[PDB]
Amino acid sequence: ANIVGGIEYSINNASLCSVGFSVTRGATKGFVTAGHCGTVNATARIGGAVVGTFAARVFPGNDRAWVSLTSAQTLLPRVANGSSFVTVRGSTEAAVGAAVCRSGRTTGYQCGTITAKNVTANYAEGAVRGLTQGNACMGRGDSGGSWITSAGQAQGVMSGGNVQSNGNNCGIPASQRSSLFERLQPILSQYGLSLVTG
């Protein structure tokens, strides 16, 4: 399968999440995603086919994971934007107030701005600290998906937010949205990954 940020994948044939970003670990191909998406050794499928397994994760506390892929997978420096793509150019962290977009299998590509950093989310499983908050909308299933600037700087992976009864927060004003992502930088250093760029 072609690995692109924002696309759907399933875990152990049950839950769905979205791919964050293509990365490498030496000769090993992988993708970063959210820790809450699967446990270590959980099987990831793309379009019905097994593509790899969860190599490591941290959740709660943090919300991060990487899936090691089979050799057959094609890693690409891109994030889905409808029928088009956003090229991943690096991982410079943007500041509060910067415009940012996110991609995921539920709400597609949505943009907003970064509103706060070092936010704690209290999930059913426990607290997740140090998240960055933006006001781009998202829905269940978008977790793990890419957060990136229009200029191609990868920011992090979707963790959570205040979804409403309809399953998303797109039905409320941006001023009222809390969409939280796990910063990419710590994931890369924790697992010794290199981002695939173009």
In the sheet with 21-25, reading across from the earlier edge strand, the strands are 15-18, 8-11, 43-46, 49-58, 64-69, 28-33, 21-25, 194-195
Closest CA to 134 of 178, 167, 72, 91: 178
Torsion of CA 156, 160, 162, 167, to 10 degrees: 110
Report phi then psi at 100, rounded to 5: -150, 155
CB 136 within 8 A of CB 179: yes
Single out the catalytic residue among 18, 22, 63, 146.
63
Closest CA to 154 of 81, 77, 73: 77
Active-site annotation holds for 36: yes
Active-site annotation holds for 175: no
- Determined by X-ray
* Segment holding 190, helix H or strand E: helix 184-191
* Cα(134)–Cα(113) distance, integer angstroms: 5
3-state SS class at 88: coil
Domain that holds residue 14: 3-76+184-196
134 and 146, same domain (yes or no): yes
Closest CA to 133 of 165, 174, 168, 167: 174
CATH number, position 44: 2.40.10.10
CB 139 within 8 A of CB 121: no
- The strand pair at 2-5 and 74-81 is best described as parallel
164 and 92, same domain (yes or no): yes
Single out the catalytic residue among 10, 18, 36, 91.
36
Active-site annotation holds for 71: no
* Cα(192)–Cα(84) distance, integer angstroms: 30
How many domains does the chain divide into? Answer: 2
* Cα(139)–Cα(28) distance, integer angstroms: 31
* Cα(59)–Cα(41) distance, integer angstroms: 15
24 and 54, same domain (yes or no): yes
* Cα(12)–Cα(44) distance, integer angstroms: 7
82 and 29, same domain (yes or no): no
Q: What resolution in angstrom units was achieved for this structure?
A: 1.7
Single out the catalytic residue among 10, 22, 143, 159.
143
CB 6 within 8 A of CB 18: yes
**Coarse DSSP helix, strand, coil percentages of the chain, rounded to the nearest 5 percent:** 5, 55, 40
Q: Do you find a cis peptide bond into 60, omega within 30 degrees of 0?
A: yes
